[PDB]
Protein backbone atom coordinates (compact mmCIF):
# COMPACT_ATOMS: atom_id res chain seq x y z
CA UNK A 1 0.00 0.00 0.00
CA UNK A 2 2.83 2.44 0.70
CA UNK A 3 4.50 1.66 -2.61
CA UNK A 4 1.21 2.33 -4.37
CA UNK A 5 0.67 5.54 -2.43
CA UNK A 6 4.13 6.80 -3.37
CA UNK A 7 3.89 6.02 -7.09
CA UNK A 8 0.55 7.82 -7.31
CA UNK A 9 1.75 10.85 -5.37
CA UNK A 10 4.30 11.80 -8.05
CA UNK A 11 1.82 12.02 -10.93
CA UNK A 12 1.10 15.76 -10.46
CA UNK A 13 4.78 16.54 -10.97
CA UNK A 14 5.04 14.59 -14.22
CA UNK A 15 1.84 16.14 -15.54
CA UNK A 16 3.10 19.68 -15.01
CA UNK A 17 6.40 18.92 -16.74
CA UNK A 18 4.67 17.51 -19.81
CA UNK A 19 2.20 20.38 -19.89
CA UNK A 20 5.01 22.93 -19.77
CA UNK A 21 6.89 21.29 -22.65
CA UNK A 22 3.82 21.25 -24.89
CA UNK A 23 3.17 24.94 -24.27
CA UNK A 24 6.74 25.88 -25.22
CA UNK A 25 6.80 23.78 -28.39
CA UNK A 26 3.21 24.43 -29.49
CA UNK A 27 3.92 27.89 -30.86
CA UNK A 28 6.24 26.44 -33.52
CA UNK A 29 4.70 23.06 -34.32
CA UNK A 30 1.47 24.88 -35.10
CA UNK A 31 3.29 26.23 -38.17
CA UNK A 32 5.45 23.21 -38.97
CA UNK A 33 2.43 20.92 -39.16
CA UNK A 34 1.10 23.09 -41.99
CA UNK A 35 4.23 22.85 -44.15
CA UNK A 36 3.63 22.09 -47.81
CA UNK A 37 6.48 22.38 -50.35
CA UNK A 38 4.12 24.06 -52.85
CA UNK A 39 3.33 27.16 -50.80
CA UNK A 40 4.41 30.51 -52.22
CA UNK A 41 2.82 32.19 -49.23
CA UNK A 42 5.16 30.47 -46.79
CA UNK A 43 8.12 31.56 -48.88
CA UNK A 44 6.83 35.13 -49.05
CA UNK A 45 6.27 35.29 -45.30
CA UNK A 46 9.82 34.12 -44.63
CA UNK A 47 11.18 36.66 -47.09
CA UNK A 48 9.45 39.53 -45.36
CA UNK A 49 10.53 38.36 -41.91
Amino acid sequence: QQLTNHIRDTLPGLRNKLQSQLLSIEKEVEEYKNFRPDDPARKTKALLQ
Binding site: K45, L48, Q49
Partner: protein
Protein backbone atom coordinates in the same frame (compact mmCIF):
# COMPACT_ATOMS: atom_id res chain seq x y z
CA UNK B 1 2.56 48.32 -47.64
CA UNK B 2 2.53 45.72 -44.86
CA UNK B 3 6.12 46.61 -44.12
CA UNK B 4 5.27 50.29 -44.15
CA UNK B 5 2.28 49.78 -41.86
CA UNK B 6 4.22 47.86 -39.25
CA UNK B 7 7.01 50.42 -39.26
CA UNK B 8 4.67 53.38 -39.17
CA UNK B 9 2.64 51.98 -36.26
CA UNK B 10 5.75 51.26 -34.20
CA UNK B 11 7.19 54.72 -34.75
CA UNK B 12 3.97 56.43 -33.86
CA UNK B 13 3.46 54.62 -30.55
CA UNK B 14 7.04 54.18 -29.37
CA UNK B 15 8.11 57.66 -30.41
CA UNK B 16 11.28 56.47 -32.11
CA UNK B 17 12.63 57.74 -35.39
CA UNK B 18 12.85 61.09 -37.09
CA UNK B 19 10.25 63.30 -38.76
CA UNK B 20 8.50 63.93 -35.48
CA UNK B 21 5.53 66.33 -35.38
CA UNK B 22 7.20 68.93 -33.21
CA UNK B 23 4.58 71.66 -33.75
CA UNK B 24 1.09 70.41 -34.43
CA UNK B 25 0.23 68.07 -31.58
CA UNK B 26 1.05 66.31 -28.23
CA UNK B 27 -0.32 63.31 -29.99
CA UNK B 28 0.38 60.07 -31.82
CA UNK B 29 0.00 57.67 -28.80
CA UNK B 30 1.93 60.06 -26.49
CA UNK B 31 -1.59 60.71 -25.28
CA UNK B 32 -1.33 57.43 -23.35
CA UNK B 33 1.22 58.96 -21.09
CA UNK B 34 -1.53 61.39 -20.14
CA UNK B 35 -3.85 58.55 -19.12
CA UNK B 36 -1.07 57.21 -16.99
CA UNK B 37 -1.01 60.73 -15.55
CA UNK B 38 -4.84 61.06 -15.61
CA UNK B 39 -5.73 57.79 -13.91
CA UNK B 40 -4.08 59.31 -10.82
CA UNK B 41 -6.92 61.81 -11.03
CA UNK B 42 -9.79 59.33 -11.08
CA UNK B 43 -8.39 57.71 -7.93
CA UNK B 44 -9.07 60.98 -6.08
CA UNK B 45 -12.29 61.98 -7.80
CA UNK B 46 -13.95 59.65 -5.32
CA UNK B 47 -14.99 61.10 -1.98
CA UNK B 48 -16.72 60.00 1.21
CA UNK B 49 -18.44 61.76 4.09
CA UNK B 50 -16.40 61.20 7.24
CA UNK B 51 -19.55 60.91 9.33
CA UNK B 52 -20.47 57.78 7.40
CA UNK B 53 -16.98 56.42 7.96
CA UNK B 54 -17.28 57.02 11.70
CA UNK B 55 -20.72 55.44 11.85
CA UNK B 56 -19.53 52.44 9.84
CA UNK B 57 -16.48 51.98 12.07
CA UNK B 58 -18.60 52.17 15.22
CA UNK B 59 -20.92 49.40 14.07
CA UNK B 60 -17.92 47.37 12.97
CA UNK B 61 -16.52 47.33 16.50
CA UNK B 62 -19.85 46.55 18.15
CA UNK B 63 -20.47 43.72 15.68
CA UNK B 64 -17.08 42.12 16.30
CA UNK B 65 -17.57 42.03 20.05
CA UNK B 66 -20.71 39.98 19.97
CA UNK B 67 -21.46 39.73 23.65
CA UNK B 68 -18.00 40.14 25.18
CA UNK B 69 -16.68 43.25 26.86
CA UNK B 70 -13.99 44.95 24.79
CA UNK B 71 -10.51 45.58 26.20
CA UNK B 72 -8.53 46.37 23.04
CA UNK B 73 -9.56 47.52 19.60
CA UNK B 74 -10.08 44.37 17.49
CA UNK B 75 -7.96 43.88 14.41
CA UNK B 76 -10.97 42.96 12.27
CA UNK B 77 -12.30 46.46 12.84
CA UNK B 78 -9.34 47.60 10.75
CA UNK B 79 -9.43 44.81 8.18
CA UNK B 80 -13.15 45.10 7.40
CA UNK B 81 -12.92 48.82 6.74
CA UNK B 82 -9.90 48.49 4.47
CA UNK B 83 -11.57 45.74 2.45
CA UNK B 84 -14.62 47.93 2.00
CA UNK B 85 -12.53 50.89 0.80
CA UNK B 86 -10.45 48.80 -1.62
CA UNK B 87 -13.47 47.38 -3.40
CA UNK B 88 -14.23 50.92 -4.56
CA UNK B 89 -11.27 51.12 -6.95
CA UNK B 90 -12.52 48.37 -9.24
CA UNK B 91 -14.36 50.90 -11.37
CA UNK B 92 -11.65 53.48 -12.17
CA UNK B 93 -9.21 50.74 -13.12
CA UNK B 94 -11.65 49.46 -15.72
CA UNK B 95 -12.21 53.00 -17.01
CA UNK B 96 -8.46 53.37 -17.50
CA UNK B 97 -8.30 50.18 -19.55
CA UNK B 98 -11.17 51.29 -21.76
CA UNK B 99 -9.60 54.68 -22.45
CA UNK B 100 -6.31 53.07 -23.48
CA UNK B 101 -8.09 50.74 -25.89
CA UNK B 102 -9.84 53.72 -27.42
CA UNK B 103 -6.53 55.46 -28.15
CA UNK B 104 -5.02 52.36 -29.74
CA UNK B 105 -7.99 52.08 -32.07
CA UNK B 106 -7.68 55.73 -33.07
CA UNK B 107 -3.95 55.39 -33.74
CA UNK B 108 -4.48 52.30 -35.87
CA UNK B 109 -7.02 54.22 -37.94
CA UNK B 110 -4.63 57.10 -38.59
CA UNK B 111 -1.90 54.74 -39.73
CA UNK B 112 -4.33 52.87 -41.99
CA UNK B 113 -7.03 55.04 -43.58
CA UNK B 114 -4.77 57.92 -44.39
CA UNK B 115 -1.87 56.10 -46.00
CA UNK B 116 -3.53 53.43 -48.17
CA UNK B 117 -5.22 53.96 -51.53
CA UNK B 118 -6.14 50.33 -52.12
CA UNK B 119 -9.75 49.56 -51.20
CA UNK B 120 -10.47 46.52 -49.10
CA UNK B 121 -6.89 46.35 -47.88
CA UNK B 122 -7.48 49.19 -45.45
CA UNK B 123 -10.47 47.22 -44.18
CA UNK B 124 -8.70 43.93 -43.64
CA UNK B 125 -5.74 45.67 -42.02
CA UNK B 126 -8.03 47.64 -39.75
CA UNK B 127 -10.40 44.79 -38.97
CA UNK B 128 -7.62 42.36 -38.01
CA UNK B 129 -5.77 44.75 -35.73
CA UNK B 130 -8.92 45.85 -33.90
CA UNK B 131 -10.04 42.25 -33.48
CA UNK B 132 -6.72 41.40 -31.89
CA UNK B 133 -6.91 44.44 -29.65
CA UNK B 134 -10.34 43.40 -28.38
CA UNK B 135 -9.17 39.92 -27.37
CA UNK B 136 -6.39 41.46 -25.28
CA UNK B 137 -9.00 43.62 -23.61
CA UNK B 138 -10.32 40.36 -22.21
CA UNK B 139 -7.00 39.09 -20.88
CA UNK B 140 -6.01 42.47 -19.50
CA UNK B 141 -9.20 42.90 -17.49
CA UNK B 142 -8.84 39.49 -15.86
CA UNK B 143 -5.37 40.36 -14.65
CA UNK B 144 -6.51 43.66 -13.18
CA UNK B 145 -9.20 41.83 -11.20
CA UNK B 146 -6.70 39.25 -9.95
CA UNK B 147 -4.61 42.14 -8.70
CA UNK B 148 -7.28 43.96 -6.72
CA UNK B 149 -8.42 40.63 -5.30
CA UNK B 150 -4.87 40.17 -4.03
CA UNK B 151 -4.83 43.56 -2.36
CA UNK B 152 -7.79 42.30 -0.29
CA UNK B 153 -6.34 38.90 0.63
CA UNK B 154 -3.82 39.96 3.26
CA UNK B 155 -3.08 43.09 5.28
CA UNK B 156 0.63 43.88 5.44
CA UNK B 157 1.64 46.41 8.09
CA UNK B 158 5.41 45.96 7.89
CA UNK B 159 6.71 48.45 5.32
CA UNK B 160 5.33 51.98 5.65
CA UNK B 161 2.26 51.89 7.84
CA UNK B 162 2.10 54.07 10.93
CA UNK B 163 4.52 51.95 12.94
CA UNK B 164 3.77 52.14 16.65
CA UNK B 165 -2.69 67.54 14.14
CA UNK B 166 -2.74 71.34 14.27
CA UNK B 167 0.09 73.89 14.39
CA UNK B 168 0.31 77.65 14.53
CA UNK B 169 1.31 80.72 16.47
CA UNK B 170 -0.69 81.86 19.49
CA UNK B 171 -0.23 84.88 21.75
CA UNK B 172 -1.03 84.82 25.46
CA UNK B 173 -2.70 88.15 26.24
CA UNK B 174 -3.04 87.92 30.03
CA UNK B 175 0.43 87.75 31.59
CA UNK B 176 1.04 87.70 35.32
CA UNK B 177 1.56 91.13 36.83
CA UNK B 178 5.21 90.28 37.55
CA UNK B 179 5.92 90.22 33.79
CA UNK B 180 3.03 91.99 32.05
CA UNK B 181 2.53 92.45 28.34
CA UNK B 182 1.78 89.51 26.08
CA UNK B 183 3.78 86.50 24.90
CA UNK B 184 3.70 85.13 21.34
CA UNK B 185 4.77 81.52 20.96
CA UNK B 186 4.62 78.51 18.66
CA UNK B 187 1.78 76.15 19.56
CA UNK B 188 1.53 72.50 18.49
CA UNK B 189 -1.69 70.60 19.19
CA UNK B 190 -1.71 66.83 18.71
CA UNK B 191 -4.38 64.21 19.33
CA UNK B 192 -2.65 63.55 22.68
CA UNK B 193 -0.87 66.62 24.06
CA UNK B 194 -0.22 70.36 23.79
CA UNK B 195 3.33 71.69 23.43
CA UNK B 196 4.55 75.29 23.62
CA UNK B 197 7.65 76.44 21.76
CA UNK B 198 9.44 79.75 21.25
CA UNK B 199 9.85 79.27 17.49
CA UNK B 200 9.01 76.91 14.64
CA UNK B 201 12.12 74.82 15.35
CA UNK B 202 10.08 73.09 18.08
CA UNK B 203 13.20 72.67 20.23
CA UNK B 204 12.38 74.53 23.45
CA UNK B 205 9.52 72.31 24.72
CA UNK B 206 8.85 74.90 27.40
CA UNK B 207 5.32 73.74 28.29
CA UNK B 208 3.50 70.43 27.92
CA UNK B 209 -0.18 69.79 28.62
CA UNK B 210 -2.58 66.89 28.29
CA UNK B 211 -5.56 67.23 25.96
CA UNK B 212 -7.80 65.21 28.28
CA UNK B 213 -10.02 66.56 31.06
CA UNK B 214 -9.90 70.15 29.80
CA UNK B 215 -12.78 72.43 28.84
CA UNK B 216 -13.27 75.23 26.32
CA UNK B 217 -15.26 78.43 26.79
CA UNK B 218 -15.74 81.86 25.26
CA UNK B 219 -14.92 85.09 27.10
CA UNK B 220 -16.98 88.07 28.22
CA UNK B 221 -16.33 91.52 26.73
CA UNK B 222 -14.23 93.08 29.47
CA UNK B 223 -11.30 93.72 27.13
CA UNK B 224 -10.49 96.10 24.30
CA UNK B 225 -12.47 94.33 21.58
CA UNK B 226 -9.79 94.06 18.90
CA UNK B 227 -9.17 90.28 18.85
CA UNK B 228 -11.25 87.12 19.04
CA UNK B 229 -10.62 85.25 22.27
CA UNK B 230 -11.33 81.84 23.75
CA UNK B 231 -10.33 80.28 27.06
CA UNK B 232 -8.95 76.84 27.90
CA UNK B 233 -9.90 76.15 31.51
CA UNK B 234 -9.87 73.33 34.06
CA UNK B 235 -12.61 72.37 36.51
CA UNK B 236 -10.96 69.27 38.01
CA UNK B 237 -8.00 71.21 39.43
CA UNK B 238 -7.64 74.85 40.41
CA UNK B 239 -4.81 75.38 37.87
CA UNK B 240 -4.07 74.27 34.31
CA UNK B 241 -0.68 73.06 35.62
CA UNK B 242 1.30 76.21 34.66
CA UNK B 243 -1.59 78.64 34.58
CA UNK B 244 -2.03 82.03 32.94
CA UNK B 245 -5.46 83.14 34.15
CA UNK B 246 -7.22 80.12 32.62
CA UNK B 247 -5.11 80.41 29.45
CA UNK B 248 -7.15 82.99 27.57
CA UNK B 249 -5.91 82.88 23.98
CA UNK B 250 -6.59 85.45 21.25
CA UNK B 251 -6.90 84.84 17.52
CA UNK B 252 -7.25 87.14 14.53
CA UNK B 253 -10.67 85.83 13.47
CA UNK B 254 -13.53 83.77 14.84
CA UNK B 255 -12.90 81.24 12.06
CA UNK B 256 -9.41 80.58 13.43
CA UNK B 257 -10.98 80.03 16.85
CA UNK B 258 -13.49 77.60 15.34
CA UNK B 259 -10.78 75.70 13.47
CA UNK B 260 -8.81 75.40 16.71
CA UNK B 261 -11.92 74.15 18.53
CA UNK B 262 -12.51 71.62 15.75
CA UNK B 263 -8.92 70.43 16.11
CA UNK B 264 -9.44 69.96 19.85
CA UNK B 265 -12.63 68.05 19.07
CA UNK B 266 -10.69 65.77 16.72
CA UNK B 267 -8.01 65.25 19.37
CA UNK B 268 -10.63 63.94 21.82
CA UNK B 269 -11.86 67.11 23.54
CA UNK B 270 -15.59 67.40 24.07
CA UNK B 271 -17.70 70.49 23.36
CA UNK B 272 -18.61 72.81 26.24
CA UNK B 273 -19.12 55.15 24.80
CA UNK B 274 -17.63 58.63 24.72
CA UNK B 275 -14.59 57.86 26.93
CA UNK B 276 -13.59 54.56 25.32
CA UNK B 277 -15.19 54.20 21.93
CA UNK B 278 -14.31 57.60 20.49
CA UNK B 279 -10.60 57.06 21.08
CA UNK B 280 -10.86 53.70 19.34
CA UNK B 281 -12.64 55.25 16.37
CA UNK B 282 -10.00 57.93 15.87
CA UNK B 283 -7.20 55.38 16.06
CA UNK B 284 -8.83 53.30 13.34
CA UNK B 285 -9.55 56.28 11.09
CA UNK B 286 -5.90 57.35 11.13
CA UNK B 287 -4.61 53.85 10.52
CA UNK B 288 -7.01 53.39 7.62
CA UNK B 289 -5.84 56.55 5.87
CA UNK B 290 -2.18 55.65 6.23
CA UNK B 291 -2.74 52.23 4.77
CA UNK B 292 -4.95 53.43 1.91
CA UNK B 293 -2.20 55.82 0.88
CA UNK B 294 -0.02 52.76 0.36
CA UNK B 295 -2.70 50.87 -1.56
CA UNK B 296 -3.30 53.81 -3.89
CA UNK B 297 0.41 54.26 -4.50
CA UNK B 298 0.86 50.60 -5.42
CA UNK B 299 -2.12 50.65 -7.79
CA UNK B 300 -0.95 53.71 -9.70
CA UNK B 301 2.43 52.08 -10.23
CA UNK B 302 1.34 48.62 -11.35
CA UNK B 303 -1.61 49.44 -13.60
CA UNK B 304 0.45 50.98 -16.41
CA UNK B 305 2.90 48.10 -16.16
CA UNK B 306 0.11 45.54 -16.46
CA UNK B 307 -1.33 47.24 -19.52
CA UNK B 308 2.03 47.56 -21.25
CA UNK B 309 2.85 43.88 -20.77
CA UNK B 310 -0.51 42.44 -21.69
CA UNK B 311 -1.97 44.77 -24.34
CA UNK B 312 0.66 46.91 -26.03
CA UNK B 313 3.55 44.50 -26.43
CA UNK B 314 1.37 41.69 -27.68
CA UNK B 315 -0.15 43.99 -30.27
CA UNK B 316 3.28 44.91 -31.62
CA UNK B 317 4.33 41.28 -31.68
CA UNK B 318 1.16 40.43 -33.59
CA UNK B 319 1.77 43.16 -36.18
CA UNK B 320 5.33 42.03 -36.92
CA UNK B 321 4.90 38.26 -36.84
CA UNK B 322 1.30 37.40 -37.73
CA UNK B 323 -0.34 40.20 -39.69
CA UNK B 324 0.75 38.93 -43.09
CA UNK B 325 -0.29 35.37 -42.30
CA UNK B 326 -3.85 36.56 -41.60
CA UNK B 327 -4.22 38.71 -44.72
CA UNK B 328 -3.53 35.68 -46.87
CA UNK B 329 -6.45 33.98 -45.09
CA UNK B 330 -9.10 36.63 -45.83
CA UNK B 331 -11.59 36.56 -48.67
CA UNK B 332 -10.42 34.74 -51.79
CA UNK B 333 -7.16 36.61 -52.55
CA UNK B 334 -8.69 37.71 -55.87
CA UNK B 335 -10.47 40.93 -54.94
CA UNK B 336 -7.83 41.87 -52.40
CA UNK B 337 -5.29 44.27 -53.88
CA UNK B 338 -7.65 45.56 -56.59
CA UNK B 339 -6.98 49.17 -57.58
CA UNK B 340 -9.55 51.86 -56.91
CA UNK B 341 -10.81 54.06 -59.75
CA UNK B 342 -8.77 57.05 -58.56
Amino acid sequence: MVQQFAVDFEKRIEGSGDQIDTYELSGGARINRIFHERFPFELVKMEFDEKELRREISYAIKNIHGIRTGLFTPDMAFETIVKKQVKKIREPCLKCVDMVISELISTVRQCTKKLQQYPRLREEMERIVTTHIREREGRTKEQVMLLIDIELAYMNTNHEDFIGIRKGWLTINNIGIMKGGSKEYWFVLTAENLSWYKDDEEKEKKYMLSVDNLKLRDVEKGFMSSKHIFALFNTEQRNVYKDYRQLELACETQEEVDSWKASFLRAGVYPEMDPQLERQVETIRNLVDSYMAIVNKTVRDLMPKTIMHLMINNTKEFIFSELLANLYSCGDQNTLMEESAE
